[PDB]
Write a protein that binds this DNA or RNA. Structure first.
Lengths: 117, 119, 115, 117
DNA sequence: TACTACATATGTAGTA
DNA sequence: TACTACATATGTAGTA
DNA sequence: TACTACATATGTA
DNA sequence: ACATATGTAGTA
């Protein structure tokens, strides 16, 4: 089983957010929210290339990478893996822990209802 | 500067500690040796690391140490989850709950509780 | 058979034992979004299939279940698993753990549900 | 959104069971646990083909249909849907519903524990 | 208990 | 782009 | 409440 | 192609 590293996650989102994406195309978008070498980043791409979460496509004269797995399909999958290891009481016990630490503003708490519908 | 995290493997440990407030060497093992399958040594190590990371502490209560948490549960869990979501979900907490219902991971029995948890 | 959309109604009725035309609708027009007529239709169907019956309690019909709830859900899930999971019930629970859909808070209850 | 109908399922399981499968190779294995026409079946496959759940492969001189979706990954998902449409209280409320209707023998109740581990 | 050992996964980047 | 290199961190567990 | 219309998904062929 | 069951919903 191949898993996606937290450092890596950075990358996927950048790709997921742009469907298609290039070596540098990504770096530029990362070298702003993070601070790594353009070489360190590239390795994070190849790494995901090999784990096989994305693929290439010599679109221009350069590779263009794209996801292979479904974003939300995987994120749900990963949170579920996490929470399970952390919170003994599934998804709920967690939500109950956000409000306990009042991480919710009435403007936001409102949206949820209209999200549970 | 040096910052220390609590490993996902380690997390199992805290959960027992936290669950018993006071906790001995084996006391934990016995309690993990059902929800998991490690060696009573592997585990003890997890404790120790957690001790040197400084999330727990000891205290020879009887003739054997009793480790106890140093950090506050809810305090840390909420903190950890935030870190997670931010790395994973681009749209914060919301975007996540949205993701669970799109995957129908909730029963109206549960979805109900939430509201009465929102008020 | 009882259709998935129809299920919505039976839940309401079983929830209320006794149940009226609109009384159903109201309790449905929040957890769903259909036309009061669509709904009504679902009831008629069920009445016609013979899962529920009427009874002019006040001056309007009062439908109630004819089939025993837990007796049906059990029957229904049986047919289901059978069409989907090759290995009966087991092979299902097994599918739920492998996709970690269970929190230890939850897995716990099971044991004491198994004794 | 495209779904997999109860009838269809009989086809997939034949397929996932043999990973690789032939038009007739299927019918054979179904005309024992079921009673349909070698044309009724074929159509179920077709539908599934178009819905996009399986795909063909001219292996010999005949097509060989193979699964396109991951078994466990979808059965999990469908059950989910079902459970929540029916049982108010998710998975739990269901298992508790099998015991009440004593649909379990101590021989099998055992396995569970060792399966919950 | 305390202290020791190790192979893989991960963060982070220089050279062909 | 491709391929190489390394130190800390994490999973697992033997020896004093 | 009671009959009918309608596009879709669906059981059978 | 064809009949039925189904999500939705208006004219009886």
């Amino acid at each position: 089983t191949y898993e996606i590293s937290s450092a890596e996650w950075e990358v996927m989102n950048i790709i997921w957010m742009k469907k298609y994406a290039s070596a540098n195309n990504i770096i530029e978008e990362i070298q702003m929210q993070k601070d790594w070498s353009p070489k360190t980043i590239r390795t994070l791409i190849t790494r995901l290339y090999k784990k096989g979460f994305i693929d290439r496509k010599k679109d221009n004269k350069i590779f263009q990478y794209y996801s292979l797995v479904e974003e939300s399909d995987i994120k749900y999958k990963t949170s579920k893996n996490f929470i399970n290891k952390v919170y003994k009481g599934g998804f709920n016990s967690l939500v109950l822990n956000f409000v306990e630490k009042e991480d919710l503003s009435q403007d936001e708490i409102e949206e949820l209802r209209n999200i549970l519908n």
